[PDB]
Paper text:
For the tetramer, 63,222 particles were included in the final 4.5-Å map with D2 symmetry applied. The two S-shaped dimers are rotated 180° with respect to each other with the four HDAC subunits positioned at the periphery of the tetramer, which results in a striking three-dimensional X-shaped complex. Interestingly, Lys839 and Lys843 appear to be in a position to interact with the inositol phosphate that is bound to the neighbouring dimer, although there is no apparent density for the side chains. This may explain why it was only possible to obtain a high-resolution map of the tetramer in the presence of inositol phosphate (7.7 Å vs 4.5 Å).
Class I histone deacetylases (HDACs 1–3) are essential regulators of gene expression. In the [name] complex, the large ELM2-SANT protein [name] (1045 aa), recruits [name] or 2. In conclusion, our structural and functional studies of the [name] complex reveal a striking molecular machine whose architecture appears to have evolved to facilitate processive chromatin deacetylation.
Residue numbers in the entry:
A (entry chain F): 720 to 829, 833 to 879
B (entry chain E): 8 to 325, 327 to 376
C (entry chain A), D (entry chain B): 62 to 130
E (entry chain L): 833 to 879
Write the structure that this text describes.
């Protein structure tokens, strides 16, 4: 039942019908952040090693935000296929330094008891502001504020 | 086997629509975590998409519509209220912080994938953030603000004489349909509930116009369709579409709200039947782009888009493995869902009627 | 227990370490091999020379643990 | 007894072998040392980092016995 | 205490937050004592 206004129709797909490999970008639109690698990693000798590498991490290894698997997931990717170059740049100076050009890393990775108490009361008063509670804690953002609200909602059960 | 390119940015799961709003972008993050713990992430080409700028968003939309979106915030909300009515931003399309940045990601993920297939450097591409199909040229609608699907499709036409678009979503794909309503080069097929339902569109008689007449198929439906029914009507049709339209590149919208037990949706499909479609299209072996879209029981959206990824990879997966959001998934912690005791109001006669009408429409095309 | 990290780092490095240890004993296997054969020559057929070699090299790894006691 | 002759040779060679094994683990001791400190850094004072390092390196030797199963 | 009443309790307390007379009428089966007891056990499970 709606109308099809000629002005608001569409913008004329404007093709050539071939345009074959016409020097397009998308190395710009997107950045490569994993390649399949089963040559030396999954040759029915090492495919189980990464399985052990990763369950290894969610334990008493260093934190970055605090879920120690994700850091190891992040770092085998970081190394492109390697073990010690992984293990070193994993443990070596900091996880932020070796990889900064993607910036997905800092996005993915991205709370004191004091702010926790004020949060609990700050939410037990409004319960749906997310603008005044943001002003309650100018240090933190609505994202982290909302993130902690979920993690608590899961810890309820 | 087919090469797969996956696109993802992490801020997507953190943008928030507002209180009680059925659209929750956090679902895409869950999928991203399950693909991983399944071990599939390992197997495919992963990418971050860069932000899509107003340069390329305006290649379909109005220059001032995008200018309005770039400018609007909740801070200047009362100042812009005159335009907000002109652009549908309101009751079910709220304003929220980071709205534009959310669009740049959903669009950038699709358009990047559009080029990768155009570049002939993949066989499949996936962007679960994308698949927003209600957006219009000059206004938002149905939780959609920018129609990345069009903007994706507009790139592919540069390379591809005929692009097929498909829509599983329980909501009709009027935005993409309207955005290609009078072009023969783009066929828009849409299976969807109809009658007392948004966007009210896509009846049997919505056929197209001008050059685009007999290039906008539709297939209305009633409540409670099964996987068996849906399969028995999906494959015959798409076979004829491939027989007639003969596209050189497909765009499947994998609307998950057509699943059983959806918050807003009232169909009775499982992961298996919803995915069996994705298998069937994959079988035809064209350059492919699978997107997401609707879906509001996010625990099953995660299950859905995860499994469907495995189908693009044609690998098996069991038992939900451990992950961050493992506790979301009920007491069962299982991938597959079963259909409800809900009634299928789609009688065989009603299905066979509309089927034959469509066959006639499809026979009108050129062939030998 | 968080200290399981040690057990699992271990499993990661065990394949690499085992490669280097095998390299070490390869230098010494000839001594073990003839010693077992000399036993099976001076005792009868019921001596498993291969079992003697394996048992000896396992015992070696046991005694090496004193490096880390 | 056969096993006595072999263990008797084993004792002769243990000093030389223990030297080479110590050389091996010296390459890997840093990885143990960082991890053990990290456990203590997170858990607290009651963790004996040196004891963790020793237990781990002993365990590596236990698992090396599978080279000679 | 059942999960059903637990959900209604959580919402029944997230609306009033200090009635203890209407929430008692929400659950006529249970008393203010058990209702108050579960409120503490949850308050301790917060930490
Ligand atoms: O209490 P749960 O069983 O975990 O369900 C809640 C609940 O949904 P229902 O009311 O349909 O049970 C919330 O709804 P309200 O309490 O806000 O009315 C909803 O919040 P929204 O409806 O605003 O989404 C929230 O979802 P979320 O956790 O995404 O905020 C969701 O929790 P689950 O998502 O864990 O089911
Ligand atoms: K549809
Ligand atoms: K059309
Ligand atoms: Zn929908």
């Amino acid at each position: 039942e709606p109308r099809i206004n000629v002005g608001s129709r569409f913008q004329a797909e404007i093709p050539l019908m071939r345009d074959r490999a016409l020097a397009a970008a998308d190395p710009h639109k997107a950045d490569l952040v994993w390649q399949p690698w089963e040559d030396l990693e999954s040759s029915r000798e090492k495919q189980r090693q990464v399985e052990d590498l990763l369950t290894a991490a969610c334990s008493s290894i260093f934190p970055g935000a605090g879920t120690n698997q994700e850091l190891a997931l992040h770092c085998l990717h970081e190394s492109r296929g390697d073990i010690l170059e992984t293990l070193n740049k994993l443990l070596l100076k900091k996880p932020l330094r070796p990889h900064n050009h993607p910036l997905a890393t800092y996005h993915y990775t991205g709370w004191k008891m004091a702010e926790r108490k004020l949060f609990n009361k700050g939410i037990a008063i409004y319960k749906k502001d997310f603008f005044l509670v943001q002003k309650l804690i100018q240090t933190k953002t609505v994202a982290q504020c909302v993130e902690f609200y979920y993690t608590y909602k899961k810890q309820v059960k | 086997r087919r090469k797969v390119c996956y696109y993802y940015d992490g801020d997507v799961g953190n943008y928030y629509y507002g209180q009680g709003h059925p659209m929750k972008p956090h679902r895409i993050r869950m999928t991203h975590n399950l693909l991983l713990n399944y071990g599939l992430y390992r197997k495919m080409e992963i990418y971050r998409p860069h932000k899509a700028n107003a340069e390329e968003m305006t290649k379909y939309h109005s220059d001032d519509y995008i200018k309005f979106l770039r400018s609007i915030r909740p801070d200047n909300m009362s100042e812009y209220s005159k335009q907000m009515q002109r652009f549908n931003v309101g009751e079910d399309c709220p304003v929220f912080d980071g709205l534009f940045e959310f669009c740049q990601l959903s669009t950038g993920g699709s358009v990047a994938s559009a080029v990768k297939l155009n570049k002939q450097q993949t066989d499949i591409a996936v962007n679960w953030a994308g698949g927003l199909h209600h957006a219009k040229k000059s206004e938002a609608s149905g939780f959609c603000y920018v129609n990345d699907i069009v903007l994706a499709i507009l790139e592919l036409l540069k390379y591809h004489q005929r692009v097929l678009y498909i829509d599983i979503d329980i909501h009709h794909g009027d935005g993409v349909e309207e955005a290609f309503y009078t072009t023969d080069r783009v066929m828009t097929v849409s299976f969807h509930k109809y009658g007392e339902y948004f966007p009210g569109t896509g009846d049997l008689r919505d056929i197209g116009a001008g050059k685009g007449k007999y290039y906008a198929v539709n297939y209305p439906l009633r409540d409670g369709i099964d996987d068996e029914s849906y399969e028995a009507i999906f494959k015959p049709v798409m076979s004829k579409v491939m027989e007639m339209f003969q596209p050189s590149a497909v765009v499947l919208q994998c609307g998950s709200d057509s699943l059983s037990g959806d918050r807003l949706g009232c169909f009775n499909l499982t992961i298996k039947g919803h995915a069996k479609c994705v298998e069937f299209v994959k079988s035809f072996n064209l350059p492919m782009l699978m997107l997401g879209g609707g879906g509001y029981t996010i625990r099953n959206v995660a299950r859905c888009w995860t499994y469907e990824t495995a189908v693009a990879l044609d690998t098996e997966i069991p038992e939900l493995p451990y992950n961050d959001y493992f506790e979301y998934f009920g007491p069962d912690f299982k991938l597959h869902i079963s259909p409800s005791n809900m009634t299928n109001q789609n009688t065989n006669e009603y299905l066979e009627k509309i089927k034959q009408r469509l066959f006639e429409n499809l026979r009108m095309l050129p062939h030998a | 227990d968080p200290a399981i990290s040690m057990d699992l780092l271990r499993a990661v490095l065990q394949p690499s370490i085992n490669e280097e240890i095998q390299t070490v004993f390869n230098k010494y296997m000839k001594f073990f091999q003839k010693a077992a054969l000399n036993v099976r020559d001076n005792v009868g057929e019921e001596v498993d020379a291969e079992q003697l070699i394996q048992e000896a090299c396992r015992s070696c790894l046991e005694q090496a643990k004193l490096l880390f006691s």
